[PDB]
Design a protein around this ligand. Structure first.
Ligand SMILES: CCCCCCCCCCCCCCCCCC(=O)OC[C@H](CO[C@@H]1O[C@H](CO[C@H]2O[C@H](CO)[C@H](O)[C@H](O)[C@H]2O)[C@H](O)[C@H](O)[C@H]1O)OC(=O)CCCCCCCCCCCCCCCCC
Ligand SMILES: CCCCCCCCCCCCCCCCCC(=O)OC[C@H](CO[C@@H]1O[C@H](CO[C@H]2O[C@H](CO)[C@H](O)[C@H](O)[C@H]2O)[C@H](O)[C@H](O)[C@H]1O)OC(=O)CCCCCCCCCCCCCCCCC
Ligand code: CLA
Ligand code: CLA
Ligand code: CLA
Ligand code: CLA
Ligand code: CLA
Ligand code: HEC
Ligand SMILES: CC1=C(/C=C/C(C)=C/C=C/C(C)=C/C=C/C=C(C)/C=C/C=C(C)/C=C/C2=C(C)CCCC2(C)C)C(C)(C)CCC1
Ligand SMILES: CC1=C(/C=C/C(C)=C/C=C/C(C)=C/C=C/C=C(C)/C=C/C=C(C)/C=C/C2=C(C)CCCC2(C)C)C(C)(C)CCC1
Ligand SMILES: CC1=C(/C=C/C(C)=C/C=C/C(C)=C/C=C/C=C(C)/C=C/C=C(C)/C=C/C2=C(C)CCCC2(C)C)C(C)(C)CCC1
Ligand code: OEX
Ligand SMILES: [Cl-]
Ligand SMILES: [Cl-]
Ligand SMILES: [Fe+3]
Lengths: 137, 243, 29, 62, 96, 333, 36, 448
């Protein structure tokens, strides 16, 4: 097995559009994930709130849907709860609250896409391991 | 007055606030206002456990016990609804707060008696027609006593209610019918009776204080054995303010 | 990138070089 | 300004590398060294100068 | 001598989300229930029937529309003490 | 005066057991710890070690044997708080909260520390060289690690090694789960210390036994060939060197007895020193190597190694140890 | 680091290891004199 | 300079410098150079790899947090506003190492072999009790001055970083240092056990600055004392007066100081600000209980009456003396004090009403931040417990600092035992073995 263009082909928006990231986009797409996300989101779970993981199936049932690139990029700009009723920028790292989360300051628009892509590509690789927990270690 | 750094390590943190002996007044109760207990505190001073008399005709006696879990026994910052029943009698319905403390006492002989000193879901009422709370007002009511352990608790052999084994895996081919009471856990829920007698009243601030006497059952260990009847005596404090 | 390796080269050899120089000069070793 | 700063800074490094090897060799040196406390005093006084020079020229480049 | 929790798995509790017993983290399996509506349901528990969840005071028209769409995923059984005590409905001690 | 006469008897080199100024502290503290240990091991009531009102039985009278028996560590509710007898409302409370454990380990560590200093003292009173106490510092350091240093780093004397055979095992198993001590070089050095120590022990023992000069007959023990206090050696070190020097090769063998015995002392002491420091450094959660999911294929799949199998085992210990003590997903204390 | 001193970035990443080399240098000098 | 003449082998070659004041002077000055060298080279290294917006304790830094604590290059919340002071400290220390390195080499391989007949002031004898106390006095004054430098920094030159500063951590000038001996020496008489913590429990800069004022004057006065005086009779008969004996006395001291430093950086979050070093062990554990109390309360949980599996409170319980504390396994850490938690602390401990209504988002951010940055890491720097998978590259600076200085402290204790034992034997005359012909034991009566 290898990192094929079919694997790196992730949903772009809410209407079925698709994009294919390069291998290098995925690689530093992981570095940036380890830079500002892995502290709470290592392995696809959430240490500060285990009830919510980064599994594709979970992101899909989120409001608004986060199972695409634009959905995750929008979340990294303005994060909300699982039903989207409240905005949680004051307790979740974002560009909107980059002042209290300094590691979100120097993240370009291109950087968020790589981060979003990595979250979508990994479960297509690790399967149930991504967002699984210690059970799948 | 006094900060955390003045009280820390002293044991005063387990003590309920006291009123000066000057506080023998009365607190007026208006029928058209709504009242609440902003803070309720219960400090036990004596744990009496009804022993179990052999088996003949004896009158069951409450023997003294020894606390072994140190000063971790008080219930504090309990708040709830202070209702004015139109008959004049008041009624306190407990809502939230530290309304439970696990306590272990040791009887003569060495037998330790674990219990859940609590006042959860307490509904205590007074005598009819109470225009003011005096130094004669006493509260009578009942409360719920949930299981000492919750459903996730596992015994030394890994058995439990909402979790764990359902048999003795150390005895694979043993007759499970005799170990039924030990293999099958049961969540208990009984009623407890408590009397809150007021002896001090500050009508200005709305603070009341006195002694109490509660009766409840002790831990039954998920239904493994029979619980002991416990009688808890101590002092209490309460601040009353309009809603 | 391997300027990396050039630094540890001259610095690392700087020690033994003194010993080698003091040997061929038969200095107070 | 930068023209003088980096030169004095690059020379300070080069001089030091000579001093690092030169000084202990000159000391442990039996013969051959009325020859060399001149060059010890040479580099030393010149080392202190370069340190001050780079130290001064620092505020003009950063 | 019966395990009440195991026995409850033989009811609708083992099938759907019991509004009177099931842990609050279960409302994540469906859209627009967690955490706003989830909090309200558990707080206003128990209910005599499933459709009583529509009678919670303060619900907006969109919220009541979301609740109706998930009535098929909800159920109501007798309140089990072993499942509601210790604040287990908000945290039953399970994570990942 | 009778003060220097007292000082003469204390530092007397003619007592059957040397006291000394270190022994002035050593004797009462060891007697206090021993007496309390023996009493507690037999008759002490169950102890709420994890501070969760779940008492653990450790004494013989309460359902234990020699293997399962233990003096149970003090409660977690206490933590690092100093808990003497006069800090309890009653002895009943004192026993419930793991009182005896603190009294024992404190009097012991002090007595054991003075034991080391005592070794220097007699060596100085006898005109010996004094580095015997240095060799004793290695097992002493190990004692401080599992009784003091690790409880300090973890913040509770409940996490100190229980005074019991099975309790010791419990300490070892939980340690591996939370620190991966096996994958730590300091414990690996320690294993190399005790394995190598045992090897060199059997080695030096067998080579000297083989070189014993014939002074006895067929019908008597060879041990009688050596008389206590004799001036000449009882074996042939040259013959020993020529045997072992051919077993491997010549220069891999010791021809110097002083250099030989120093190696016999150096190897295990150093090894035990590191495994002592291993426990001491892992007390501040500087754990062993974490190679979990370190090997990855071209796609991204995790290719397991033996470290991943070790990890699966650690997970089993982790999720089972103290099954009712944890309320939150991460084990920090 | 200031952008003016970005020149010596590879040099900076080497300097901390230099003291350790002094410990190793003692063995060179001793080996040079044959461990007298 | 060989074994036949000196009596020492090459692996103990530095023991030949015992009676050579000249070369020994060069050895110490050269070693001093190595110290100042590392202090500068590492600083430049840390600054080179430093990322401003990224936390210090996520970049494996130990020296920059020290400078930051002194108030240089930091602002409100411990945020880095200027990296230039870090550069100066690194450069100045580094350049100075060349100076100490120059005289270190000179005094060693070409300076006079002995100082005693170059100078009577610099030349010394180990057994000269007057000369030793005098040198002791000089260096005592030097240490006293250094302590006043910290005081001067805190009171006159910018100040220090106060993590307890109102409105959040910030650089603050200490204007009222604690001079009360009941407080300063009160710390020295505190228990080393839980709830007390000896001198480690110092929680305000006022006690720190005022403390260094005391120790400043004490060392100076003590310095003057030992300079003008000579060792009393009871002191002359108690100690061993030799070069190795003095070394062992210092080895025991540094060993003790090593153990003290180990406990400081692991427990204290005042002189070691959490914004720079990361959360302490107790701190992170309390933050987890804090983090899930907040999360559950938002869901509608009554954390005051929430019973846990064991019967104890799931979120809140009582300490043995009755203080309201965080529930769970973190009950052991109820003596933790931090600026992010104290706003919720009342007279009887944690106030449930402050918990229900007054908790602020910045407290929630800090709790989650410190929970996920607990000082638990592998040797190869994999963050979290041993069972954690590879992803986060993190080991808290506190772990590096506590572990390293315990290894050193223990070995220096061994050093004390080694060098003191030999100092006794040497001064008595049997460090080279038992005289075959005056074996002391053979002149003693049998034990039985
Ligand atoms: C094996 C055979 C042994 C034979 C005998 C030889 C004995 C000595 C052996 C020394 C080790 C040899 C290999 C060294 C390679 C190395 O180490 O290389 C590792 C690092 C450099 O690698 C970098 O290591 C980093 C470590 O993370 C650090 O930096 C990260 C990113 O900033 C994070 O901030 C993290 O929190 C922080 O810990 C990252 O992983 C980087 O990605 C990685 O490139 O070298 C460094 O650090 C250099 C630091 C060394 C000196 C300081 C040691 C401090 C020890 C304190 C504790 C003492 C007690 C220990 C008990 C055990
Ligand atoms: C020569 C003279 C010898 C005299 C011997 C007889 C005297 C006894 C000596 C002590 C013996 C050990 C006792 C336990 C030490 C300990 O638990 O020390 C812990 C204390 C710190 O304690 C903690 O102190 C903390 C202070 O932090 C508080 O205040 C802070 C302020 O920033 C924060 O706010 C923080 O949140 C808050 O909790 C708290 O009080 C904690 O409750 C408390 O546990 O450190 C300290 O006192 C530092 C001092 C002890 C250092 C450790 C010694 C280790 C010795 C190793 C020996 C090895 C032997 C090998 C032989 C071979
Ligand atoms: C302040 C510290 C100090 C000082 C000034 C001295 C001074 C002295 N010691 Mg002492 N000693 C100290 C600390 C100190 N010691 C400590 C802490 C210990 C305990 C470990 C010892 C143990 C000790 C012993 C056992 C002996 C001495 C002896 C000596 C004398 C000769 C030393 C020599 O030539 O070593 C030569 C130095 C070496 C051979 C180098 C050793 C390097 C070690 C083994 C490894 C270092 C690893 C490094 C830290 C990490 C890895 C680096 C790299 C590989 C990556 C001298 C009087 C000797 C004596 O009695 O003389 C009379 C002697 O036999 N010391
Ligand atoms: C901290 C480390 C340290 C220091 C400062 C010293 C210092 C000293 N040792 Mg010791 N030594 C050490 C470690 C150290 N040693 C270790 C680890 C070992 C075990 C291998 C030994 C083994 C040892 C022995 C066996 C002997 C000494 C002796 C000496 C003294 C004379 C050395 C001499 O003449 O060399 C001559 C060497 C040279 C001339 C070669 C060059 C040396 C210089 C210093 C190199 C400088 C390099 C540096 C980059 C220069 C920068 C200059 C400028 C830019 C600042 C000297 C005071 C001797 C002694 O006691 O004599 C009385 C002796 O017999 N040492
Ligand atoms: C007080 C000592 C100390 C401490 C606490 C730290 C702590 C730290 N250093 Mg630093 N460092 C130190 C000294 C120290 N360093 C020294 C002296 C040097 C010069 C060589 C360096 C060079 C250095 C570099 C180049 C880097 C660090 C980095 C780091 C970080 C990661 C370290 C790591 O992964 O090590 C890996 C762990 C090991 C290699 C294990 C070594 C174990 C030793 C050998 C144990 C020895 C014990 C004892 C002495 C044995 C004696 C035996 C004898 C008695 C027989 C961390 C913040 C890194 C970082 O993140 O920087 C930003 C980095 O890049 N350090
Ligand atoms: C530990 C420190 C120390 C000590 C005790 C000595 C002692 C000695 N040195 Mg040495 N020396 C040292 C460090 C030291 N030196 C260093 C670091 C260097 C490199 C710069 C030198 C370079 C050196 C040379 C080149 C010579 C000596 C010589 C001498 C002798 C005469 C000194 C004299 O007349 O000073 C007189 C000095 C003064 C009256 C005032 C000095 C003021 C100083 C520089 C600063 C004071 C402020 C403060 C303390 C600075 C602290 C800095 C830092 C530690 C924070 C004497 C044996 C001479 C010798 O042996 O000839 C045969 C000789 O030629 N030394
Ligand atoms: C670096 C510090 C240092 C050092 C190495 C020395 C060394 C010396 N001093 Mg000096 N001294 C110092 C600092 C120092 N002093 C300072 C700063 C002052 C000013 C306060 C003094 C004031 C002073 C006086 C007044 C005297 C000395 C004397 C002495 C000599 C004997 C010391 C002795 O017997 O101690 C060992 C001490 C004892 C055996 C007494 C009991 C000590 C108990 C057991 C300490 C318990 C500590 C505890 C475990 C931990 C600390 C916490 C708390 C309890 C405090 C010796 C030459 C004596 C001398 O001969 O002068 C000519 C003398 O009379 N010193
Ligand atoms: C790197 C900058 C990050 C990215 C990208 C995301 N996070 Fe987080 N996160 C955290 C919590 C406690 C939650 C759950 C709380 C809630 O949603 O109410 C989340 C959730 C997300 C989600 C939503 C997942 C879903 O809807 O199922 C996404 C898409 C997400 N996060 C992306 C906590 C933390 C945290 C600790 C403070 C960090 C550093 C991050 N999150 C980082 C990232
Ligand atoms: C600061 C600076 C500088 C300086 C530097 C220095 C000072 C350096 C030094 C360096 C050094 C000082 C080096 C050294 C090195 C050494 C070595 C590297 C060694 C090694 C050794 C070995 C390897 C050994 C081996 C052996 C022997 C021979 C014997 C025994 C056995 C054995 C085999 C082990 C300069 C100028 C650059 C400039 C920049 C800055
Ligand atoms: C005695 C002895 C010894 C030792 C020795 C020693 C230890 C020495 C030291 C020495 C030293 C200790 C030296 C030092 C030096 C230093 C230097 C030389 C520095 C320099 C610096 C610089 C050059 C800088 C630069 C810069 C600048 C200016 C800015 C920033 C950047 C840069 C970096 C570029 C031994 C053992 C070997 C052997 C023999 C004996
Ligand atoms: C700054 C500071 C402070 C203060 C501090 C102080 C004030 C200190 C002091 C300290 C001290 C004041 C110390 C002392 C010490 C002492 C010692 C360490 C001693 C020792 C001794 C010895 C070791 C002896 C021995 C012996 C004996 C036992 C008998 C006879 C013989 C001999 C001599 C061997 C505070 C906390 C506020 C805060 C933080 C900062
Ligand atoms: O106490 Mn004894 O074992 Ca040290 O980790 Mn946390 O805490 Mn408990 O769990 Mn795992
Ligand atoms: Cl366990
Ligand atoms: Cl927990
Ligand atoms: Fe032998």
């Amino acid at each position: 097995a290898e990192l094929t263009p079919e694997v790196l082909t992730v949903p772009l928006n809410s209407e079925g559009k698709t994009i294919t990231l390069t291998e290098k986009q995925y690689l530093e797409g992981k570095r940036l994930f380890q830079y500002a996300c892995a502290s709470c989101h290592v392995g696809g779970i959430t240490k500060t709130n285990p009830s919510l993981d980064l599994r594709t199936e979970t992101l899909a049932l989120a409001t608004p849907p986060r199972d695409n690139i634009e959905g995750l990029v929008d979340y990294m700009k303005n994060p909300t709860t699982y039903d989207g009723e409240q905005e949680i920028a004051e307790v979740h790292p974002s560009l909107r609250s980059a002042d209290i989360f300094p590691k979100m300051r120097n993240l370009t628009e291109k950087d968020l896409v790589a981060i979003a892509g990595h979250i979508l590509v990994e479960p297509k690789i690790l399967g149930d391991k991504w967002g699984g927990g210690k059970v799948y270690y | 007055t006094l900060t955390y750094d003045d009280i820390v390590g002293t044991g005063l943190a387990n003590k309920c606030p006291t009123l000066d002996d000057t506080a023998r007044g009365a607190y007026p109760i208006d029928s058209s206002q709504t009242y609440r207990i902003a803070r309720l505190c219960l400090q036990p001073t004596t744990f009496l456990v009804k022993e179990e008399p052999k088996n003949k005709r004896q009158e069951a006696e409450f023997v003294p016990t020894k606390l072994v879990t140190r000063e971790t026994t008080s219930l504090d910052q309990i708040q709830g609804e202070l209702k004015v029943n139109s008959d004049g009698s008041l009624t306190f319905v407990e809502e939230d707060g530290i309304d439970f403390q696990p306590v272990t006492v040791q009887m003569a002989g060495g037998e330790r008696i674990p219990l859940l000193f609590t006042v959860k879901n307490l509904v205590a009422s007074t005598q009819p027609n109470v225009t003011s709370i005096t130094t004669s007002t006493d509260f009578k009511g009942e409360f719920n006593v949930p299981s000492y352990r919750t459903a996730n608790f596992l015994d030394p052999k890994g058995r439990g209610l909402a979790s764990g084994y359902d048999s003795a895996i150390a005895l694979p081919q043993a007759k499970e019918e005799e170990l039924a009471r030990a293999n099958v856990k049961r969540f208990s829920l009984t009623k407890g009776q408590i009397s809150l007698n007021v002896a001090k009243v500050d009508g200005r601030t709305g603070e009341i204080a006195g002694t109490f006497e509660s009766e409840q059952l002790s831990d039954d260990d998920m239904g493994a054995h029979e619980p002991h009847e416990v009688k808890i005596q101590g002092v209490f404090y309460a601040s009353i303010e309009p809603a | 990138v391997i300027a990396q390796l050039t630094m540890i080269a001259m610095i690392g050899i700087a020690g033994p070089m003194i010993i080698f120089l003091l040997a061929v000069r038969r200095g107070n070793l | 300004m930068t023209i003088l700063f980096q030169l004095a800074l690059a020379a300070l490094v080069i001089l030091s590398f000579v001093m690092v090897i030169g000084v202990p060799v000159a000391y442990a040196s039996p013969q051959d060294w009325d020859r060399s406390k001149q060059l010890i005093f040479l580099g030393s006084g010149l080392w202190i100068a370069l340190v001050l020079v780079v130290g001064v020229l620092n505020f003009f480049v950063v | 001598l019966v395990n009440v929790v195991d026995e409850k798995l033989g009811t609708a509790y083992g099938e759907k989300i019991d509004l009177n017993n099931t842990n609050i983290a279960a409302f994540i399996q469906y859209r627009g229930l967690y955490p706003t509506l989830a909090k309200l349901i558990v707080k206003n528990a128990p209910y005599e029937s499933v459709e009583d969840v529509l009678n919670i005071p303060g619900l907006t028209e969109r919220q009541k529309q979301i609740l109706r769409e998930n009535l098929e995923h909800f159920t109501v059984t007798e309140v089990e003490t072993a499942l509601v005590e210790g604040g287990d409905r908000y945290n039953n001690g399970l994570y990942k | 005066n009778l003060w220097e006469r007292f000082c003469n008897w204390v530092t007397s080199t003619d007592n059957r057991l040397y006291v000394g100024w270190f022994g002035v502290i050593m004797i009462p503290t060891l007697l206090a710890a021993t007496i309390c240990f023996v009493i507690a091991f037999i008759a002490a009531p169950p102890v709420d070690i994890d501070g969760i009102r779940e008492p653990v039985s450790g004494s013989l009278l309460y359902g234990n044997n020699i293997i399962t028996g233990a003096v149970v560590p003090s409660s977690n509710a206490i933590g690092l708080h100093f808990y003497p007898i006069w800090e309890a409302a009653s002895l009943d409370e004192w026993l419930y909260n793991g009182g005896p454990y603190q009294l024992i380990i404190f009097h012991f560590l002090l007595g054991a520390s003075c034991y080391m200093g005592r070794q220097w003292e007699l060596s100085y009173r006898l005109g010996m060289r004094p580095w015997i106490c240095v060799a004793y510092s290695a097992p002493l350091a190990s004692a401080f690690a599992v009784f003091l240093i690790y409880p300090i780093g973890q913040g509770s004397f409940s996490d100190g090694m229980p005074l019991g055979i099975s309790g010791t095992f419990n300490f070892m198993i939980v340690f591996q789960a939370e620190h991966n001590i096996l994958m730590h070089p300091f414990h690996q050095l320690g294993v190399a210390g005790v394995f190598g120590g045992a090897l060199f022990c059997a080695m030096h023992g067998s080579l000297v036994t083989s070189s014993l000069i014939r002074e006895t007959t067929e019908t008597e023990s060879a041990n009688y060939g050596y008389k206590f206090g004799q001036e000449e050696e009882t074996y042939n070190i040259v013959a020993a060197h020529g045997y072992f020097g051919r077993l491997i090769f010549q220069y891999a063998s010791f021809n110097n007895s002083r250099s030989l015995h120093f190696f016999l002392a150096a190897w295990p002491v150093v090894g035990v020193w590191f495994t002592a420091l291993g426990i001491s450094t892992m007390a501040f959660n500087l754990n062993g190597f974490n190679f979990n999911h370190s090997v990855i294929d071209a796609k991204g799949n995790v290719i397991n190694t033996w470290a991943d199998i070790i990890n699966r085992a650690n997970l089993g210990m982790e999720v089972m140890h103290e099954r009712n003590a944890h309320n939150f997903p991460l084990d920090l204390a | 680091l200031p952008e003016a001193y970005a020149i010596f970035d590879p040099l900076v990443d080497v300097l901390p290891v230099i003291p350790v080399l002094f410990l190793a240098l003692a063995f060179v000098w001793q080996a040079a004199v044959g461990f007298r | 300079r060989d074994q036949e003449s000196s009596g020492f082998a090459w692996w103990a070659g530095n023991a030949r410098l015992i009676n050579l004041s000249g070369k020994l002077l060069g050895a110490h000055v050269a070693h001093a150079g190595l110290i100042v060298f590392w202090a500068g080279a590492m600083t430049l290294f840390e600054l080179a790899h430093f990322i401003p917006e990224k936390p210090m304790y996520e970049q494996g830094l130990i020296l920059i947090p020290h400078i930051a604590t002194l108030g240089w290059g930091v602002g409100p919340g411990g945020e880095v506003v200027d990296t230039f002071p870090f550069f100066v400290v690194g450069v100045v220390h580094l350049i100075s190492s060349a100076v100490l390195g120059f005289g270190g080499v000179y005094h060693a391989i070409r300076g006079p072999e002995t100082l005693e007949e170059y100078s009577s002031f610099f030349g010394y004898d180990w057994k000269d009790k007057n000369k030793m106390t005098t040198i002791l006095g000089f260096h005592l004054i030097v240490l006293g001055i250094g302590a006043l430098l910290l005081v001067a920094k805190a009171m006159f030159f910018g100040g220090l970083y106060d993590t307890w500063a109102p409105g959040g951590g910030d650089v603050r000038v200490i204007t009222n240092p604690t001079l009360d001996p009941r407080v300063i020496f009160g710390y020295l008489l505190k228990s080393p056990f839980g709830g007390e913590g000896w001198i480690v429990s110092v929680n305000n800069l006022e006690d720190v600055v005022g403390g260094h004022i005391w120790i400043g004057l004490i060392c100076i006065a003590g310095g003057i004392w030992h300079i003008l005086t000579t060792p009393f009779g009871w002191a002359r008969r108690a100690f061993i007066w030799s070069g190795e004996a003095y070394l062992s006395y210092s080895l025991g001291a540094l060993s003790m100081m090593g153990f003290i430093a180990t406990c400081f950086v692991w427990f204290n979050n005042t002189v070691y600000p959490s914004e720079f070093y990361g959360p302490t062990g107790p701190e992170a554990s309390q933050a987890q209980a804090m983090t899930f109390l907040i999360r559950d309360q938002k869901l509608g949980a009554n954390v005051g009456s929430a019973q846990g599996p064991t019967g104890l409170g799931k979120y809140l319980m009582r300490s043995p003396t009755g203080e309201i504390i965080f529930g769970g396994e973190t009950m052991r850490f109820w003596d933790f004090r931090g600026p992010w938690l104290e706003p919720l602390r009342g007279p009887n401990g944690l106030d449930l009403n402050k918990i229900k209504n007054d908790i602020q988002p910045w407290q929630e951010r800090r709790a989650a931040e410190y929970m996920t940055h607990a000082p638990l890491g592998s040797l190869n720097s994999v963050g979290g417990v041993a069972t954690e998978i590879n992803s986060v590259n993190f080991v808290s600076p506190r772990s590096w600092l506590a572990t390293s200085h315990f290894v050193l402290a223990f070995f220096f204790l061994v050093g004390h035992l080694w060098h003191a034992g030999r100092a006794r034997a040497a001064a008595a005359g049997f460090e080279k073995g038992i005289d075959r012909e005056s074996e002391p034991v053979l002149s003693m009566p049998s034990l039985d």
